[PDB]
Symmetry: C6
Subunit: 196 residues, 6 copies
């Protein structure tokens, strides 16, 4: 039954869309659950600042990481999977209506490409927007020493992160994967557009 | 078999009801299990007050959070999924009775729209009630410093929360999702009512 | 296959029995695993008494909670699901015997209502018994300060519980659900009895 | 498919064997995973003795509990499920051989009751043996204060257990369940033996 | 479908091979996941030596246990399941080739016993090799007091293990199971060899 | 259904490819989830250096392990499974196109070996590249004493690892498995190439 269901969902799509779904499944969803989630396991437990003031660790950790990268990548992978599901539901409803019309009439370039172009444009726009936001907030490296200058701590305090090399490696890896997806969408659009 | 079962459950519904079920599944149930649950992981472990009195942390944490937002959203998502299931069970029983009457007679605007309107009204009422309760209790922001004035602590004590920016972001996100659902229900009601 | 199996288990029952099974599944089993289990997560870790005697915390925590509410509700939900399963197995065996007699004879008010009445009476009796036991042991509120008077501690010691508001809310919620089930069983009995 | 498989495994057995399988599933396997496992969660973490000698806690905890009750009940539930599976595999092989002989000959009181009696006798023997062992080692109660007299601790030390009331309740509960099973096996044997 | 798949995998094998597969599944894989894994849960957390030198605990724990028994039993259960899978894949390929030859010719003592003998010999050899290795490294008991004589600790230090009785019981239990399997393989070989 | 699906995925492949898939599944994916993951459980919790400077442990642990071996093996097992999936998807699309041409024409040495050779060459290249990287970074042993010379610690500090024998054993084991796979790929290539 599983095989048949798979056929039903992915049997009517482009080959570049198929390899995009492959790089979505085997390289993003598989990587996020297996290995990169445990690297952000002991985030707040190993974060250690250098003072004796009670509660300076919480405000300095909050000012260091406004949002952890795992939940940011989860929101990124949710907001780029919605238009594909919308296009699939629309083409499923249209295929069902045309099949019903075929069954009722056997007993007696259009909206699809428009929705396809719209879905591809929204996917590329959300990808480049999330890349610009991540470049604006964090950069693409983590230093082992962070300087904190927030109340109620005294003037300046030093805090030390937890394993800042492995997270740098995984940040660069997800950046490479997102750039590959952004290039592949434009490749697919120019492959489908110049056949007119 | 899975595909067939899905057809059986969702093949007789409105398209706005279909996109409401989509925003129920992919945006509420998927978001609650994956990312936002781990943000409320170390709630009571990282909560730290500034005193030496034994047991002031427990009473100040209790007075700060009367109920955590995760269980509140779980009760919200339970109390708005009951009338949809009731409508589906009622239309399933009516469809089974009409199919049995059709099978026994082949060998020889009404209650449905009423229940549909009732289910939509109860869904919108429970949504706006839970929004008013959450606006009354917490507001829509978390400050990093909380002042506690409860026995057996001395006069006033300061307590520091854990990562109050990320929880503010997720609170605003769930507020936007609930407002979108509340608008979509009224859109569906006015779409189905003016066809008379 | 799943759908068919469901049909097989629940296709021959009363409609009040169907909504009782609905309030059993979606309101008791679903609520116990999702949200209310994590509220009793850090029970013994956050329980803190006010002394320096080694081991007073264990005996005072034992005298405070003779049995936690989660395991008590699990025993309550087990002891009220046995007679329904017994009635279903009995009617399945009787239906199989009558179907075998029909197949062997096509090639050529009674015990059921008695067992139904017995199952409903045992369900209501166990419900009111567990409610009386929970009213006798704990009451329906948790105070934030408990006084302990047990050896080997000195004369009287104070202990502070962990988040006593949220547990009060969930205790009141499960009480309301159990009272609704107890009323619904009597409603079903009077609905099925006055048709004679 | 599930339903059919269930039919295949349990369609040829005695009714007392059916209710024995019911009390095996819903009362032993279901109870061990859900509630009683979490009661033995923080066993060695909350065990606290009264001294300053390093390492006295480990030897006194070892002399207190030679084997925890959870693993003892797991071994008990394994050693009483083997003869039922052996009888089922034997009757499956005999049914397959007789069905093959029937298919090869349509184209042209004995060993079963012996194995049934042997399986019932071995089940009752292992039940009463495990009950005698548990009565010999622990008794049927846990005191909150234990006296330890083992090297390298000094002369006598006091140790305090963790929640000794709840474990007493569950020990008495499993004792009642095992006595009910032991009585039911003898009831089934005398029900099947006096029909000769 | 499950039932059919099971038939497909185990329908062509010896009865002693069937009871060997039974003692492989219900007594090794079932026992390792359920109960004996939690006994080695807090291994390094409860291991406590008697000194104040920083880092003596790590080197003394390393010299005490070169490899924990759980991973050793996992490697033992992997290295004795490979030849059975190899024999099954070989007989599956040979059965497929003979079935293809039968289908292409209906439209118009040998290698198997050799591989069977080879698989049984390799299984018995790896079993007795792992038993000799475990007898050489650990013995078959754990003492509660271990003497450590390794740098950078001072001259001799005492360390105390965690619950050394329960692990002794489980070591003796797995030894009995492995000896039963080693005897059963030779019984199966002499049962299949003297029929010539 | 499962069996059929398995047939569909693996019924058209080489026998050396089949035993390569066997050594991929039963020896890499099975070993990584069961036993070797728990050995790297308490990595940063048991790592202990010998100083009193706050935060020297984080920078010395970061300089010791730039990336843990578990995530490195996960990236290794991902980057060698992509060309097999690409070859399978390509031969599936070609088989579907040829089957469609056969169905449309019944109603009225090439690209495959090229892709096979390309997939085998890329697999062997990525294997030897990951082996060279692991030989360059870590070596194939872990010492129990590591010397750290990084700011903001003083001149030289000693740090002690956690269980450095078991990790050495598992590193040697995965090295042996990878060398066996690298030899088997060349064996398969020379077996398929000299048949011309």
């Amino acid at each position: 039954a599983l095989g048949k269901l798979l056929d039903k969902v992915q049997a009517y799509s482009t080959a570049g869309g198929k390899v995009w779904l492959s790089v979505l499944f085997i390289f993003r969803i598989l990587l996020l659950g297996t290995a990169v989630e445990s690297a952000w396991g002991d985030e707040q437990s190993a974060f250690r600042c250098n003072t004796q003031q009670p509660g300076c660790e919480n405000v300095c950790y909050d000012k260091s990481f406004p949002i952890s990268h795992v939940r940011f990548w989860v929101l990124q992978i949710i907001f780029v999977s919605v238009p594909t599901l919308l296009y699939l539901a629309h083409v499923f409803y249209v295929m069902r209506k045309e099949e019903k019309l075929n069954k009722k009439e056997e007993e007696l370039r259009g909206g699809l490409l428009r929705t396809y172009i719209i879905s591809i444009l929204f996917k590329s726009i959300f990808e480049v927007a999330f890349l610009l936001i991540q470049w604006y907030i964090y950069g693409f490296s983590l230093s082992a020493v962070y300087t904190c200058k927030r109340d109620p701590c005294p003037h300046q305090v030093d805090c030390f992160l937890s394993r800042p090399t492995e997270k740098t490696i995984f940040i660069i890896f997800m950046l490479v994967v997102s750039l590959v997806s952004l290039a592949l969408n434009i490749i697919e659009l120019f492959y489908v557009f110049f056949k007119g």
